[PDB]
Amino acid sequence: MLEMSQERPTFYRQELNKTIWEVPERYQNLSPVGSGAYGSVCAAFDTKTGLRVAVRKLSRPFQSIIHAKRTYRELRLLKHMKHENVIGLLDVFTPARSLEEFNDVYLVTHLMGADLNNIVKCQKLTDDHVQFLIYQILRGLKYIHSADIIHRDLKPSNLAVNEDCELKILDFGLARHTDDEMTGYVATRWYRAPEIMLNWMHYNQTVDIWSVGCIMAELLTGRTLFPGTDHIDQLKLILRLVGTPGAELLKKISSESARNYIQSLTQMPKMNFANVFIGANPLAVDLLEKMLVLDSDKRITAAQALAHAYFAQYHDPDDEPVADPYDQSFESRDLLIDEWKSLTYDEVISFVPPP
Numbered sequence: 452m453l454e455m456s457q458e459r460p461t462f463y464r465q466e467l468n469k470t471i472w473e474v475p476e477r478y479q480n481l482s483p484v485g486s487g488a489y490g491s492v493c494a495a496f497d498t499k500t501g502l503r504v505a506v507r508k509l510s511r512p513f514q515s516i517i518h519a520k521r522t523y524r525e526l527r528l529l530k531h532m533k534h535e536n537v538i539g540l541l542d543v544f545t546p547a548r549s550l551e552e553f554n555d556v557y558l559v560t561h562l563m564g565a566d567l568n569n570i571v572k573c574q575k576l577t578d579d580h581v582q583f584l585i586y587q588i589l590r591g592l593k594y595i596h597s598a599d600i601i602h603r604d605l606k607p608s609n610l611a612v613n614e615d616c617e618l619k620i621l622d623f624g625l626a627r628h629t630d631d632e633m634t635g636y637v638a639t640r641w642y643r644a645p646e647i648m649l650n651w652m653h654y655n656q657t658v659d660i661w662s663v664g665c666i667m668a669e670l671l672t673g674r675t676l677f678p679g680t681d682h683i684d685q686l687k688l689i690l691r692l693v694g695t696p697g698a699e700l701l702k703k704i705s706s707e708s709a710r711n712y713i714q715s716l717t718q719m720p721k722m723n724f725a726n727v728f729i730g731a732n733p734l735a736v737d738l739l740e741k742m743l744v745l746d747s748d749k750r751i752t753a754a755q756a757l758a759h760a761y762f763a764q765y766h767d768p769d770d771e772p773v774a775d776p777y778d779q780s781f782e783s784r785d786l787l788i789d790e791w792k793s794l795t796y797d798e799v800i801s802f803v804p805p806p
Contacts, residue, residue, distance in 0.1 A: 457800065462546050467493065470508065473546045474557060478506060486510075489627070494562055497541075504541065507558040512795070519791035521626055522556065523781070526798055528624045529558065531598065531777050533805070536591030538563070538611070538621050543802050550796045563611035563619060567666070570612045571673070578732070579764075580616055581670045586757070586765045587618035588663050593753040595623055596656045597773035603654065604628040605662035606642040607669070636680045642666065645689055646747060648682060651704045657747035660756075664742030671731050687716075693745045694721035700746040734761040 460475040468483045470491045482494040490507045497504045512522035529540035542559035546552075567584075570576070576584075588610065595602060602609075602623035609621045622628075633640040633648070644661035646652050668676040677692075679685020690696075695718045701710050724736045724743075738761050741751040751759075757766055781794070 459548065460544075472506075472508065473555070474506065475544060478504070478559075481506065490558075497559070500541070502541075503562045505560050505562045507560070509556040509558065512556050513554075513788060513792050516786075516788050516791070517626075519788045519795070520786075523791050523795045523798070525625055526556070526558075526795055527777075527779075527781070528600065529560075530798060530802065531600075531774070532594075532623075534591055534594040534772065534774070535617075536587045536619055537594060537623070538619050539805070540802075542804060543799055545796075545799050547796070550793060553792070553796050556795065556799060561619075563613075563621075565612055567607035567610040567612055567618075571607075571670075575673075576670065581667075582735075582761065583616055583765060584610075584612070584618050584670065585663065585667050586762050588620065588666065589753045589756045589762075590771055591618070591620045592659055592663065593757060593771060594774050595620070596659070596753055598775065598777035599656075599779070600624045600777060601654055601656045602659045602662070604639075605659045605666075606639065607666060608638070610666075634681065636678065638675075640682070640685065641675055641678055644747065645686055645745070646704075649686065649709060651706065651709055652747075655747050657750045657752075660742050660750045660753070661747070664739055667735070667739060667742070668728070671728060671735060689745075690716065690719060692722050692727065693743055695719050696745055703746070703748070732761065734759070737761070 460477065462473050462475055464471065464473045465481075466472070467481060468486070468491070470483075470486070472481055472493065474481070477498050478495045479498060480496050484492045484494050484505070486492070488510055490509045493506045495504050495506045509522060511518065513519045526543065529538070529543075532539055538560060540558065540560060544557050544559075545555055547554065592602065592605070600623060602620065603625070604622055605620070611619045611621060628639070631637075631639045640648060642662045642665045644658045647654055647658050665676045677685050677688045679688050695716055696713055701713060704710050704713075724740050725733070728736050728739065738751075738756065738759050742756070744750045756762070757771055758768075
C-alpha cells in the first residue's frame, strides 16, 4: 500500500539543433522551439496526459554559486505552485541515476502559446474580456502572495492567455529580472513600482499590485500607463498621476539623498482618475485608484480586490484558494555549488506528479 521503489522510465537520446535531448519515451516528436540563456525548449507530445507540452533543458544550471542557487530556487517555486492561474510544473526529470552523474535538468510544462501582448495585437478586447483577465491575475496573485512569494516581474509578457480567455501567471519569484537592462525606453521597467525602481525601500508583495494596476490601465486604454524614456522620466510620469509624496511616505524612505530629491520636485496634487480614464467603468476607475497609491503600505491587497464590486460577476470566496506554506529558509543560507546541486537533485528525484 506504500511505494518503496521509484521505477525509472526508459530514456532516449537524440540531437536537435546541436543540443542533446535525452528524455523519457513518454515524450514523443520533440520540436525545437527556441534557445535563450534560460535553456533550450522543445514542443512535445506527452503520451500520458494527451497534452502538448514544453520541455525545457536548463542551460548551465550549476556553473556558479549564484546560478546553482537560481536553479534550485526556480525548481522550488515551480514545484510549490498548484493553482489554475499560475504556471504549474507537470514533470521534472534528469537522465542521471545518481548524484555523481547528475548534470542536466529538464522541466515539463503546459505548452502556453500566446501571451497578453499577442492577444492585444490580434483583437480589441471586449469589456468583459478585460474584467475576466484582471480577475484571474488577481486570483493567481492572491495564491502567490498567500505563500509569501513576490512575483517581482509581473508584466504582460509574463501572462499566457488561451482561446477561452484563461490566464496563467509566469516567471514569479526569480532573481533573473535583474539581468534585463532597465535603462531607457524599455518595457520591463514600465510596470515597476517607483520604490523598487529607485530602491527607496526593499521589496514587498505590494510591489506586484502596482504592476497589475499598470496592466489594467493598459487593458482599458490600449496605452502604456507610464512609458518613461528613463527612470527619472518614468518617475515624473508617475508623480503627475498620483501626486508627489507626503510626510508619512517620505519618512518610510531610507536614503537621505532620495528624500532631498523628492522634495526638490515641485509638489503636485493627485489627479482625478475619472478624467484620466474617460469612458471607463466607474468601478474600474475606482479600483485603479486603490492600486495606484504611491505609498505601498496603503495599496489594496489581492484578497481585497477580488471582493471589490468591479468583479461581482466572477467573485466567489469559495473558489479563490490560498497556497500551502512555502519554506524559503534557503534564501538566507550560505552553501557551496555542490551543495546547491545536491538539494536540486533531491527535489528532482522527489517530484510527485499531479493526480
